[PDB]
Amino acid sequence: GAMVSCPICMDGYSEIVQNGRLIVSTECGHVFCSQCLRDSLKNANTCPTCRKKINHKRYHPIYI
Amino acid sequence: GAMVSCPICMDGYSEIVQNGRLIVSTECGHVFCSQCLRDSLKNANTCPTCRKKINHKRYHPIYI
Numbered sequence A, B: 001g002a003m004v005s006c007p008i009c010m011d012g013y014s015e016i017v018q019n020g021r022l023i024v025s026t027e028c029g030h031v032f033c034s035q036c037l038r039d040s041l042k043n044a045n046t047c048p049t050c051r052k053k054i055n056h057k058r059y060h061p062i063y064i
Ligand SMILES: OC[C@H]1O[C@@](CO)(O[C@H]2O[C@H](CO)[C@@H](O)[C@H](O)[C@H]2O)[C@@H](O)[C@@H]1O
Pocket: A001, A016, A017, A020, A021, A022, A023, A062, A063, A064
């Protein structure tokens, strides 16, 4: 358990994990829920926060 | 701001960031404070949690 919020949907950890989503981080350290990041990746290969490229799986779950 | 705790020192986010440390994640998704992970890396090249190899900078800050 943790208290972190996804900046795209603005849900808290409780709401994210209740819905079966993962907390994920880009390799540039930007944290989102899995759904928002994967959805962003359908339209853009860049980090939603800093626009560094994150395709080729330069992101991963964080187990918190 | 976030509420996460480092499993090695067991400090909360407030105490970690007050002390100038970073929150970091391994690429295997395991979250620590920077001091504990870097200290672990002096003795072992493996994740403190799952023992997957994490040297060659297979870890990074998470900005929460
Ligand atoms: O929802 C992700 C969140 O759940 C935790 C347990 O609190 O991990 C569990 O759920 C994941 C998603 O189904 C699994 O991948 C994982 O193996 C399981 O322990 C947190 O670690 C994670 O942040």
